[PDB]
């Protein structure tokens, strides 16, 4: 019928897209990089650890000046940490006892936090009254919250739960632009350093990038077996790395859009939770569900020394903006601060 | 010993905040919570409404000097493989299936009866490996339809194998048997399989008895004899 001919067109178009993808490739990336020697064998000892919570910890993010740290707890508590002095700034009670994502505004004024309550709550930090007070209740979408990040003081981008992603405004609660191209629930999103593009990853073994101002599809990538549970960007806006629940790593580039090195290991069977890069784009710190923090090389596939000091499974990991510290949080009440 | 005025003020405030949060956790320790997986939009509104007297909705009461809270996760319309693991500290899960829901086309596939997908859902949540120490309570709610529905419509249509005669007791026991036989790990959990009613307010007392039983066996297997 008419549907069958449309499907034939779609599959044929995919055919020449794959033909172009195969034609663009010339040689494997690791083929040329073999000339350089490895950095070596690296490890770090625990530097300081904190004892502040009573249950599982899901969300934890750095500040804007690489000095302030905030984390989200299973109980309706929100805590503000200090790096060197290991003191604490504030402990903000929450309304919705269930949360899964916390964000920190770069201007040092706002903190975002949301959960399964299908709402987004924004609190002001410094006020002339003297206590932290909630500002408004930005909500409206039909799905649960998966990730929430900040662009600047007066726009915010939230990762939906059903199939969508949108850009919002703070002064007005109305949503400006809505994106509907995915085929399932979405997991997390990451913003580019230029603050003009962002890649978000759904659960249908695909991921794509978007336009902040224009607002429709540019490119689509596939080539995984199951959902992607982690996304991160290169320090320079040229490539990005994708994870998977099958414990395999995967790196994507933009213009060449070609197949790159697959950071896979034979003895690893169990999956991953979160991933982020460090400065210079040389090391790929990764979090696993086997109580392990494997370290790989950006330009070589060689295995390197690992960090393992948490009894119970780890969830998130992140590095500072100056390369002076890295912190990982696990499902136990403990939170660790490395070098 | 090098701390200045601001430093010791900060550490004193840190200690105060720590003691407040510790006391808050102590306050929030000793309350039981339950999960209400409806598995059908028929009786959940009922079962929540007689207990009282957007997204997740919370209902709270006090009964015989013991606090309760209920969480509803019925209408979310999303895949459960990603958010179910967030519920690990729940003591027990209340499961409900309507009685007269059989002999219906489900209005979607018009081939499978509601018993089918209800059994698959119950089996899937029973063999969820995150749940090992959790207990299950079954509540058959809309009983008043069954006695007159059975004589016009027997259970033979809904089952390939035989179901005996047509009397209330045997049918109740037989429904009970396919409800019971779904389990595989009988060594750790237990079932209560009540037949509730629309009056007499004995359901609250039954819930009290079931929850105290779970507490008792939990502590016993935790320490000493068990």
């Amino acid at each position, epitope marked *: 019928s008419e549907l069958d001919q449309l499907r034939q067109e779609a599959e044929q178009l995919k055919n020449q897209i794959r033909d172009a993808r195969k034609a663009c490739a010339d040689a494997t990336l690791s083929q040329i990089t073999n000339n350089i020697d490895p950095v070596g064998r690296i490890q770090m000892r625990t530097r300081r650890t904190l004892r502040g919570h009573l249950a599982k910890i899901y969300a934890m993010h750095w500040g804007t000046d690489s000095r*302030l740290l905030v984390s989200a707890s299973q109980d309706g508590k929100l805590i503000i940490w*200090d790096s060197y002095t290991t003191n604490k*700034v504030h402990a903000i009670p929450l309304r919705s006892s269930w949360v899964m994502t916390c964000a920190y505004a770069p201007s*040092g004024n706002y903190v975002a936090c949301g959960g399964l309550d299908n709402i987004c709550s924004i609190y002001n930090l*410094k006020t*002339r*009254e*003297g*206590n932290v007070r909630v500002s408004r209740e930005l909500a409206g979408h039909t799905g649960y919250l998966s990730c929430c990040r900040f662009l600047d003081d007066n726009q915010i981008v939230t990762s939906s739960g059903d199939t969508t992603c949108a850009l919002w405004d703070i002064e007005t609660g109305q949503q400006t632009t809505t994106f509907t191209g995915h085929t399932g629930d979405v997991m997390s999103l990451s913003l580019a350093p230029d603050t003009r593009l962002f890649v978000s990853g759904a659960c249908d073994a695909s991921a794509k990038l978007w336009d902040v101002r224009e607002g429709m599809c540019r490119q689509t990538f596939t080539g995984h077996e199951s959902d992607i549970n982690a996304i991160c960007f290169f320090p320079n806006g040229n490539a990005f790395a994708t994870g998977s629940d099958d414990a395999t790593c995967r790196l994507f580039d933009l213009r060449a859009d070609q197949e790159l090195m697959t950071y896979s290991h034979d003895n690893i069977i169990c999956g991953i939770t979160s991933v982020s890069f460090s400065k210079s784009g040389r090391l790929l710190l990764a979090g696993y569900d086997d109580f392990n923090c494997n370290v790989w090389d950006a330009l070589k596939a060689d295995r390197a020394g690992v960090l393992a000091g948490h009894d119970n499974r780890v969830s998130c990991l992140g590095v500072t903006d100056d390369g002076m510290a890295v912190a990982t949080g696990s499902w136990d009440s403990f939170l660790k601060i490395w070098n | 010993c*090098t701390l*200045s*005025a*601001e430093d*010791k*003020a*900060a550490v*004193e*405030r840190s200690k*105060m905040i720590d003691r407040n949060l510790r006391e808050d956790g102590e306050k929030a320790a000793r309350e039981v919570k339950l999960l209400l997986l409806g598995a059908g939009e028929s009786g959940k509104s009922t079962i929540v409404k007689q207990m009282k007297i957007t997204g997740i909705v919370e209902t709270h009461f006090t009964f015989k000097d013991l606090h309760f809270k209920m969480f509803d996760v019925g209408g979310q319309r999303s895949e459960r493989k990603k958010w179910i693991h967030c519920f690990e500290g729940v003591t027990a899960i209340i499961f409900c299936v309507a009685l007269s829901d059989y002999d219906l086309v489900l209005a979607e596939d018009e081939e499978m009866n509601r018993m089918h997908e209800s059994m698959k859902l119950f089996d899937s949540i029973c063999n969820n490996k995150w749940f090992t120490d959790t207990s299950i309570i079954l509540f058959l709610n809309k009983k008043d339809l069954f006695e007159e529905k059975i004589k016009k419509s027997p259970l033979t249509i809904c089952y390939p194998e035989y179901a005996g005669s047509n009397t209330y007791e045997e049918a109740a026991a037989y429904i009970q048997c396919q409800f019971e036989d779904l389990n595989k790990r009988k060594d750790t959990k237990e079932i209560y399989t009540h037949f509730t009613c629309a009056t007499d307010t004995k359901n609250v007392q039954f819930v009290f008895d079931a929850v105290t039983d779970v507490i008792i066996k939990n502590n016993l297997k935790d320490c000493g004899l068990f």
Partner: single-chain antibody
Amino acid sequence: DVQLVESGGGLVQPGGSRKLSCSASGFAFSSFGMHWVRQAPEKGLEWVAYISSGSGTIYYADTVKGRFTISRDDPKNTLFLQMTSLRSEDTAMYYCVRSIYYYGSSPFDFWGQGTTLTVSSSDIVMTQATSSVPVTPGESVSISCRSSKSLLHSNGNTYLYWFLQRPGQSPQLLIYRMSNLASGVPDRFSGSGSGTAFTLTISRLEAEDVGVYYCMQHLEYPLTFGAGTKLELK
């Protein structure tokens, strides 16, 4: 708002007593801390005492070490302060203040209205030798301030506060640290301090810029105050 009032006053012969109370008005009295300062008729200021949050650490002055008493009550949002016996050098006004301490904290924001009381008829010293300058409006003139001891500390911060007091009103927080300027002030001013000898510079002399300025330090436990530098409008 943060409106604050003080109760108590009058005249009493030496050896008498009077009760001093202040009532908080909805500004998070739970987390903040109180203070008290001395102000002789036309002279400088002098620190009285301290109160911490949670009835913990408490500090007393030297001149009133065995003399003054103070207490705080969390409910009713009020502060308590008692006189036992009055000497001939206790005739001064009060100006209680508030402050909180954390990372980005700005101490000494609000200022009260004060109250007079008439009876009958080590420290890093601040000099502020400058007294009066004939500055005319429309230009930039600065005032210097240097100490007796080097306030720099290995943490990486300085401790000096600046204030401005219009005649007949309460002061206001100008800058709490060098290159750090408190809210409620335009961008005409700057820090301009280094070493152990600091100054403060203004861009243009505006009409409401006439008054007096004072120098603070927050290094040693007992705080003392600077001199008075009156600015004349001519």
